[PDB]
Amino acid sequence: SFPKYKPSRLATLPATLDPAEYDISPETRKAQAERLAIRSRLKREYLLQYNDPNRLGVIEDPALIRWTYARSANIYPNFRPTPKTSLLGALFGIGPLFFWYYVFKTDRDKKEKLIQEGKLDQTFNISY
Amino acid sequence: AFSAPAAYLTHQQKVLRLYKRALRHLESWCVHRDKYRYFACLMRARFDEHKNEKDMVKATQLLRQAEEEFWYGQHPQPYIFPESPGGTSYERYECYKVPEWCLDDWHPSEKAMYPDYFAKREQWKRLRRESWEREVKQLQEETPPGGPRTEALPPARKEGDLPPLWWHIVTRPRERPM
Amino acid sequence: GAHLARRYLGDASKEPDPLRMPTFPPDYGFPERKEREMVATQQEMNDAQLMLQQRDYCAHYLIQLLKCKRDSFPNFLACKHEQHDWDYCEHLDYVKRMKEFERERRLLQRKKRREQREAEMARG
Amino acid sequence: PDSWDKDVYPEPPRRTPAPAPQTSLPNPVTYLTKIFDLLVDRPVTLAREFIEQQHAKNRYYYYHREFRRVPDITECEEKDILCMFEAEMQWRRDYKVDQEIVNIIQERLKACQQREGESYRQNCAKELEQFTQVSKAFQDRYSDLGAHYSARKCLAKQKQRMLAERKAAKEAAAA
Amino acid sequence: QQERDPWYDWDHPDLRLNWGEPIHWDLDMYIRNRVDTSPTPVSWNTMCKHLFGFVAFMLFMFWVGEIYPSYQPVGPKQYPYNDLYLERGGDPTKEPEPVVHYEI
Amino acid sequence: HAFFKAMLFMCSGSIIHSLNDEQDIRKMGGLYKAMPFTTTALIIGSLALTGMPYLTGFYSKDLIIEAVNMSYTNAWALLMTLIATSLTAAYSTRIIFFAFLGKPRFPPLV
Amino acid sequence: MLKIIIPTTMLLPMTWMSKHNMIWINATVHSLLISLISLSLLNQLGENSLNFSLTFFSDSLSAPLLVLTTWLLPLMLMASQSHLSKETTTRKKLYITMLILLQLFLIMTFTATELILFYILFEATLVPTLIIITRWGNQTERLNAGLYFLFYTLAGSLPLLVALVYIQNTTGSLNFLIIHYWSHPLSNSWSNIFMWLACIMAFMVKMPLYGLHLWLPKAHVEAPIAGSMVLAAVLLKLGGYGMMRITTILNPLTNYMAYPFLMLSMWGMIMTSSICLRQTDLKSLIAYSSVSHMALVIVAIMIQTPWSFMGATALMIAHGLTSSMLFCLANTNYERVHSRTMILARGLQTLLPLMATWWLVASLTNLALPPSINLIGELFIITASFSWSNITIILMGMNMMITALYSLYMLITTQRGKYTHHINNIKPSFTRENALMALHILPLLLLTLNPKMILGPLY
Amino acid sequence: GFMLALELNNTTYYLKFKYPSQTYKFSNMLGYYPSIMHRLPTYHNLSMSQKSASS
Amino acid sequence: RHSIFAVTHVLIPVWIIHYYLKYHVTAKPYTVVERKPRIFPGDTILETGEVIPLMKEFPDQH
Amino acid sequence: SDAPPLTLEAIKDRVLYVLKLYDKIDPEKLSVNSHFMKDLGLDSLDQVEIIMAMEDEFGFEIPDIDAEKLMCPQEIVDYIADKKDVYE
Amino acid sequence: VHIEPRYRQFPQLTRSQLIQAEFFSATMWFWILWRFWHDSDAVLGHFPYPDPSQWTDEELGILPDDE
Amino acid sequence: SKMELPDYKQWKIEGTPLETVQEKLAARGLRDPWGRNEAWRYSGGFANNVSFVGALLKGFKWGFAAFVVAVGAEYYLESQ
Ligand SMILES: CCCCCCCCCCCCCCCCCC(=O)OC[C@H](COP(=O)([O-])OCC(O)COP(=O)([O-])OC[C@@H](COC(=O)CCCCCCCCCCCCCCCCC)OC(=O)CCCCCCCCCCCCCCCCC)OC(=O)CCCCCCCCCCCCCCCCC
Ligand SMILES: CCCCCCCCCCCCCCCCC[C@@H](O)O[C@H](CO[C@H](O)CCCCCCCCCCCCCCC)COP(=O)(O)OCC[N+](C)(C)C
Ligand SMILES: CCCCCCCC/C=C\CCCCCCCC(=O)O[C@H](COC(=O)CCCCCCC/C=C/CCCCCCCC)COP(=O)(O)OCCN
Ligand SMILES: CCCCCCCCCCCC(=O)SCCNC(=O)CCNC(=O)[C@H](O)C(C)(C)COP(=O)(O)O
């Protein structure tokens, strides 16, 4: 009836256009209640320390610790040399170096062969 | 932002939210008040046309088609209240909100001014200290063994009791702190 | 625009090219052309510090206007006759350039026409 | 002013037109100039003359340092470190002096461009010509030495250039 | 992080995060000072086609306008002293070819 | 451009401050008589911006449009400049119409 | 030159004979006076160096490095006396002894006339640094970091030794004056190629060069505050100074052997600068900005021009000051919240207004705002690189854009936005911290008025 | 421009409601330039700065 | 107090700058360079008293 | 200067003014403590329009979760006072 | 000055603001009229545009197609 | 300060476009229950407003009178 909206990676599907929020099973409602319970216990655990008069300092957050540890120190122990990993490493790490080497070497070879035959107009080029 | 959320929104809540959102966007399209009144009455009639539908499959399908209508017909630049999340003054005064615990670190020369304010603050601190264990006890007794199902908090049920977890709600900085 | 339409939509060989022009000698049709006169010398223009673009056959009127503006400085509404004279001279220069454009256009439309008519008597 | 030599920093004779008013309206620039002279320039000159009387009571001089000429790198033997040292120091001093010569010529060029106004392209031909020659000589002398330059590398560059010139001159004589 | 409800009572209001909840691997990419993935009024690819088409059309028409320029029906601007030969750089010891302008 | 663009921003700021930090023209109604000096200043600024004859804007912008018309110019650039000149008056009209004409659309506590 | 060395050596018995509560005062005062004495070395000649004796000499390249080295010790002592409060007296004196020994080794390293003595001191600087990192670092990773610091350096410098005693066996001397005057070209042969590599890779690892820079994000992050300050400000510049000194023997071989290193530097500049954009650890972000900045010094030394050498000297000095200030600024927050996560403590400009000004000035100098000497060095290197090849402007330009992005990001994350609600132990700034920031930033700005003092022997 | 804009603005007083054109969407959302250029290049650059450069 | 602001914020700064420019900056050559003054036909020079000749008998097309 | 220090009585007055301007609810019957459903016989859809009218009156947006609950003018007054930090 | 909020009425205005606004609008219109009366050529031009068709073939040096 | 709200019984939709909306909605079988709340936007000094061209010529009359008097004075004074 109308031009349809299709989601993308950087422009996602809205909640009101998502068919999941319109085909609800009892199991879906049970899952939503469980999610609310998990969020609620975490909220209560946070607010108990937050409101505490005695507490002085920073409340330590295990989720933040897990995030930073996973982003730095958990990566190498969970690495396996695979054809995808090997190919991506070789390309992304080696290819730019030889690409730039080729570009710069070509440009400098042209410049030197121009200097050799005395056709560059290097006049007023005192500083280098 | 003050009421605890529920596990889900019912059909009635969804259709009401759609009604309010569509009315706001219609007002964005219809700048003038008389034209807005006209088309808002037409919108209300269109909503009332299926007010008492009892086929939940049909009601859900109608709500879904209404959502698809709104998304295509929404104003790309809807009006937003200045202090609302998308507005031009949303978090403008957050740089001026200073937590009250900072007052504990004032030099005694700074506290020499405002003696009455700091005496009242000492009374408030004593009140907060004296009622913490009762609030913790109330929370433990009231809540279920598994844990709290919802983020709703209980009121004070005895006489000399304060509602549990009240200090940070009460001692909010301000909406215009400076 | 008309001159743009007649060139880009009509036959471009019938109208002058603004870049390659003139293509005919200055004496192709004229019997006796006198060389265009200049009043201000090179030293006068140089002393005046006029812009290179400004140093055009209308330069003496511009020099007079500049001198008048400097002499009556506080009264910045006194150099009306001088500005009028300089503007009139520049207007005359512009209509001279328009005359050159029209002359080139009609020479070019006469030339190919006369050669194609000479070819018109050469069919048999 | 007598501070600097006018032969090494020249300028044209400074032709200034006489004021020739045409209107009867007062000139605000003249009134402001009189105010500036009476309120700003006079106290400044008074303070300066006081400073100069205080200076004249104490007079002392500083002398420009004169350096002897020593043998250059061409006369030094291969491994005679002391003559190499003296030749290299003299070469470095000459390099600095050449840099300042180019600086003087560049200052002349800039001053000409600013002074001549809209006619600089024609009235600064002499300054541009002097800078072109000085720049060409400086480029021939010190260009491409790189970091770690020395009198030996300059001598090698000059010898290579003279060999190129000799070959080019021998090529022309055969025609 | 911009897609989450701004009317919820987040533990961290600026970051819209709750204490103890799992954190997305790319949180610092999504902090809403940065990459936004919020739904838009016009769907992605609808916007890309229109933007790219507009830019390509403007470039093509600028090239066409360069091919077919606009000008006034006049001849070249004439300059007296050998087309200001001495003024436009000099070289006084050359005596260039007379460029001659005649009245018309 | 400095003169009338700065003064236009000043008039916009005056409207915003008098309306409790509202910047959307859809909530500015009839301010023609409620803020007479602001209306005069903004009208004069829009007329200066639009190239109205003998105003500050006129002594440059109108000379620019002629200069493009009398030059060896890219044709598409000339067309774009003329269309943009028309759109300038268009959006000046939009500001004046939606901010100063009509009936009030702001909250009732004036 | 002993008028600086001997007073520095007297800091050891003075520290060991001081009262339990007077060590910091005595050490700070006398290291500041040693800095005052060191300022006299800035009076340099235009033609040759200040040849004090057969052993020690000073040049326009080593004098600013010496001044920065002596100036850094009082700042390290000020930055260290807070987190070492609960320490015993003898261990405090041992920490101060480590710092004094490090300064002594660096001072002799920058002024040694002979390359073997330079090598011995430049390697001796490892022992105090490793002891500092692995004894007073806070976490369990500090041990691994130490190993990474120890073996990356040595694996580079062990060939260098073999090269140096080789060179003396063929030219007869390792004296730098003799080496410079009696210089000869390097032929194009495999033996000369490997001699070139042995003379260069040791310094490349110290810079460090992108690819062998892994030790640095570990060592700087795990080190205590004075350790990271000296690691960033002075120890990284040992590679630059040594490369500048040793390049004379290398020509004309350097023209073609520099290509892989120029490619690695010009690409790793982009790589590390972009790495800074996604870094959850603030101290790690500051550490990576150092690799991004030293890539430029490597490029400037490899292309071998007077403008590049001037730019490299200026950039080394400016980076030393700015990176030391940034590490101190991060430590101020760490001593409050005891975590190096950048998003843990936010909105600090509201709670600490003047430290926010310090943060802003440090970030401005990090992104080379004109006319700071950071910008002077960067722009000189960029101009010389443009002369070397115009296409370089693309890579150089890109790096500048990225550097401003992660600098201000670092500023916006920690200072702006809203402060996290739970934290309530954020005390007002101490006078010690504010003065430590001021003594970093004021000399940096003052060096703008006399840049020739930091432009090296090519000025 | 004055006349056309004024006429189109007076048109808004009429009691008609219709959905906007695609050209209006293009104009109001700024040619979709911020919606594309502030999301695609930033996302790709920030994704490569972590996926390959760092990890 | 009546006009104290105009001397501590204008007169004093213009005294230091005028002293600085007149006796220190202009001591070095080419430090302050001025655009050459325009000369028109009929002008009289204040240095040599020279008179510039007039502009060559205009066509007088009026 | 800026807006005056709005008080509790002013909030109540404006809420009752807006309610009395609603055609559905008669002025005499309406009371501060009147329930919008039991007392006035108003549907859920009707209630949403009252909330939007209050937003337009006071110039700020009330969230949907918060908005549904408000069934009496006193409740609306208390909500607005809590948001604007009004203590008299 | 002290004007109070009025709650759904036209705001209170002063005499000075109205006379100033009217005075400046009148000044702008007088300036436009004065300049148009004195400097019409700035808008309507001062010189006429010559028609090339009105130029004779002898004015431009054109031969009668036979030479 | 010290001011109260005008009577709510004065806000009538009579004579305003709110009447037109009411008639158009009555011809459709509906009613508009919020019209009176908007009535104040058409009642007092907001009842009438200027058009676009009248706003553009805000001070044309007085300026024109001054212009014509100045021209009349100078044209006859120029005949010295
Ligand atoms: C003097 C000598 C020369 C005489 C020339 C002849 C006389 C004039 C000729 C006519 C000129 C246009 C006059 C009407 C303009 C349109 C206004 C209108 O009603 O819009 C209706 C409609 C939007 O209305 P709506 O969405 O219903 O609005 C809802 C509400 O009104 C929403 O309400 P709101 O409050 O949002 O207001 C919306 C807004 C306006 O709403 C809009 O946003 C749309 C307005 C677009 C107007 C665009 C005009 C200029 C466009 C230049 C573009 C260059 C080429 C770009 C091509 C890109 C291709 C990818 O209303 C306004 O504020 C006023 C609009 C502007 C009025 C004044 C315009 C003056 C400038 C144009 C005339 C210039 C005359 C002087 C020329 C002298 C030359 C020497 O837009 C159109 O349908 C036409 C727009 C014009 C261009 C459309 C072209 C078709 C696009 C696709 C073509 C196929 C491409 C295939 C692929 C190719 C790939 C290679
Ligand atoms: C991640 C960070 C690591 C640090 C990076 C260090 C980079 C070191 C690279 C050394 C630069 C150049 C080395 C030698 C110069 C040329 C090498 C070769 O590729 O070129 C050809 C060399 O010819 C052949 O290719 C021989 C080389 C082939 C065998 C070597 C294997 C190289 C593969 C790359 C290994 C990875 C290097 C790093 C190890 C960890 C030149 O042609 P040719 O005219 O004939 O030889 C002239 C040289 N002469 C004058 C000495 C005779
Ligand atoms: C943190 C990692 C850093 C790694 C640094 C390691 C690379 C150092 C470079 C090579 C070191 C050994 C060089 C030896 C010292 C040079 C002295 C010299 O000139 O001797 C050569 C001899 O050169 C050699 O023998 C060197 C050959 C290599 C031996 C050891 C192999 C080491 C691995 C080689 C490749 C690795 C180098 C680059 C790796 C970079 C780091 C990843 C010629 O002497 P003569 O024999 O007298 O010849 C003339 C008369 N016949
Ligand atoms: C610019 C705007 C864009 C256009 C937007 C397009 C939206 C679609 C227009 C038409 C709307 C619909 O289809 S209407 C949605 C279709 N389905 C139903 O209505 C089911 C029956 N509803 C009930 O029974 C509830 O009671 C309820 C009615 C909510 C009242 O509840 P209260 O009385 O207890 O508050």
Amino acid letter, E81: Y
CB-based burial label for G125 (10 Å; 0-12, 13-18, 19+): buried
C-alpha dihedral sign at G357, G360, G366, G367: negative
Q: Looking up tokens 């790309």, which residue turns up? A: B76
Residues with Cβ within 8 Å of D19's Cβ and at least 6 positions away in sequence, in order, are: none
CA–CA separation, K37 vs L74, rounded Å?
Answer: 12
J26, J43, J56, J66: which is the annotated catalytic residue? J43
G159 lines ligand 3 (CB under 6 A): yes
Residues of F in contact with K44 (CB under 8 A): none
Cis previous bond, B78, omega within 30 = no
Residues of A in contact with B73 (CB under 8 A): 2
For D103, half-sphere exposure in the C-beta direction (CA atoms, 13 angstrom radius) is 7
Cis previous bond, J27, omega within 30 = no
Q: Which of G225, G235, G423, G397 is nearest to G327 (CA)?
A: G225
Which among B7, B72, B166 has the least Cβ separation from residue A3? B72
- Cβ distance C46 to D123 less than 8 Å, yes or no, reads yes
CA–CA separation, A8 vs G39, rounded Å?
Answer: 63
Q: To the nearest whole angstrom, how far is the Cα of H42 from the nearest Cα of chain F?
A: 29
Kindly state the tokens that stand for G268: 């790793």
CA–CA separation, C54 vs C62, rounded Å?
Answer: 8
- Cβ distance D135 to A122 less than 8 Å, yes or no, reads no
Q: Which of G144, G256, G141 is nearest to G196 (CA)?
A: G256
Q: What angle do CA J29, J34, J38 make, to 5 degrees?
A: 95
User: Does residue D17 sit in helix, strand or coil?
Assistant: strand
Q: Is the separation of the CB atoms in J18 and J54 below 8 Å?
A: yes
Kindly state the tokens that stand for G58: 């000073």
- Cβ distance E48 to H50 less than 8 Å, yes or no, reads no
Q: Looking up tokens 């420009």, which residue turns up? A: D64
User: Does residue E4 sit in helix, strand or coil?
Assistant: coil
Q: To the nearest whole angstrom, how far is the Cα of H18 from the nearest Cα of chain E?
A: 17
Best mutation target among F37, F38, F52, F69 (most K Cβ atoms within 10 Å) is F37
Q: Is the separation of the CB atoms in G62 and G110 below 8 Å?
A: yes
Cis previous bond, I59, omega within 30 = no
- The CA distances from residue E5 to A10, B8, B84, E15, in Å, are 18, 14, 12, 11
Minimum CA distance residue for ligand 4 atom 3: B70
Which among B32, B33, B88 has the least Cβ separation from residue F23? B88
Give the helix ranges, DSSP H, for B52-107. 56-73
**Separation of CA F87 and ligand 1 centre (Å):** 10
- The CA distances from residue K62 to C18, C27, C35, in Å, are 20, 10, 19
**CATH ID of J8-84, from 2.120.10.30, 1.10.1200.10, 1.20.1540.10, 3.40.50.300:** 1.10.1200.10
- Other C-beta atoms lying within 10 Å of the C-beta of residue H11: 9
Task: Look up residue G41 and give its DSSP letter.
Answer: G
Q: What is the 3-state secondary structure of D84-147?
A: HHHHHHHHHHHHHHHHHHHHHHHHHHHHHHHHHHHHHHHHCHHHHHHHHHHHHHHHHHHCCCCC
- Other C-beta atoms lying within 10 Å of the C-beta of residue B15: 21
CA–CA separation, B37 vs L25, rounded Å?
Answer: 10
**Separation of CA G50 and ligand 1 centre (Å):** 77
B80 lines ligand 4 (CB under 6 A): no
CA–CA separation, G313 vs G62, rounded Å?
Answer: 9
Amino acid letter, F59: Y
**Helix (H) or strand (E) segment spanning residue B28:** helix B11-29
Minimum CA distance residue for ligand 2 atom 14: G193
* G114 strand-pairing partners: G175
CA–CA separation, G285 vs G330, rounded Å?
Answer: 10
- The CA distances from residue H52 to A93, C37, G282, in Å, are 8, 75, 20
Kindly state the tokens that stand for F9: 């921003």
Length of chain C: 124
User: Does residue G169 sit in helix, strand or coil?
Assistant: helix
Minimum CA distance residue for ligand 1 atom 59: E54
Length of chain B: 178
Minimum CA distance residue for ligand 1 atom 9: H4
Kindly state the tokens that stand for I26: 């202009």
* G51 strand-pairing partners: G57
Cis previous bond, B82, omega within 30 = no
Q: What angle do CA C26, C27, C32 make, to 5 degrees?
A: 120
- Cβ distance B2 to E9 less than 8 Å, yes or no, reads yes
- Helix, strand, coil shares of chain E, percent, nearest 5, are 25, 5, 70
Q: Is the separation of the CB atoms in C63 and C56 below 8 Å?
A: no
Give helix D151-173 / helix D125-142 axis angle, nearest 10°: 110
Interfacial residues of D (vs E; Cβ cutoff 8 Å): 119, 121-122, 125
**Radius of gyration for the alpha carbons in chain F, expressed in angstroms and rounded:** 17
- Other C-beta atoms lying within 10 Å of the C-beta of residue A29: 12
Q: Is the separation of the CB atoms in G351 and G274 below 8 Å?
A: no
Kindly state the tokens that stand for D152: 């030996």
CA–CA separation, H53 vs H46, rounded Å?
Answer: 10
CA–CA separation, I41 vs C60, rounded Å?
Answer: 10
Task: Look up residue D38 and give its DSSP letter.
Answer: I
Q: What is the dihedral of CA G316, G318, G321, G323, to 10 degrees?
A: -70
**Helix (H) or strand (E) segment spanning residue C3:** helix C3-8
Q: To the nearest whole angstrom, how far is the Cα of F22 from the nearest Cα of chain L?
A: 18
Backbone angles phi, psi at B141, to 5 degrees: -65, -45
Q: Which of G261, G270, G283 is nearest to G145 (CA)?
A: G283
Got the DSSP string for B108-142?
Answer: HHHHHS-HHHHHHHHHHHHHHHHTHHHHHHHHHHH
Task: Look up residue E73 and give its DSSP letter.
Answer: S
C-alpha dihedral sign at A40, A42, A44, A47: negative
* Nearest-ligand number for the alpha carbon of G193: 2
Residues with Cβ within 8 Å of B103's Cβ and at least 6 positions away in sequence, in order, are: B118, B121
Best mutation target among A58, A75, A112 (most G Cβ atoms within 10 Å) is A58
In A, residues 85-124, which contact D (CB 8 Å cutoff)? Answer: 122-124
Amino acid letter, H27: S
Technique used: cryo-EM
**Between chain K and chain C, are at least 3 CB pairs below 8 A?**
yes
Residues with Cβ within 8 Å of F100's Cβ and at least 6 positions away in sequence, in order, are: F28, F30, F31, F32, F39, F42, L55
J43 is catalytic: yes
Q: Looking up tokens 């003496």, which residue turns up? A: C60
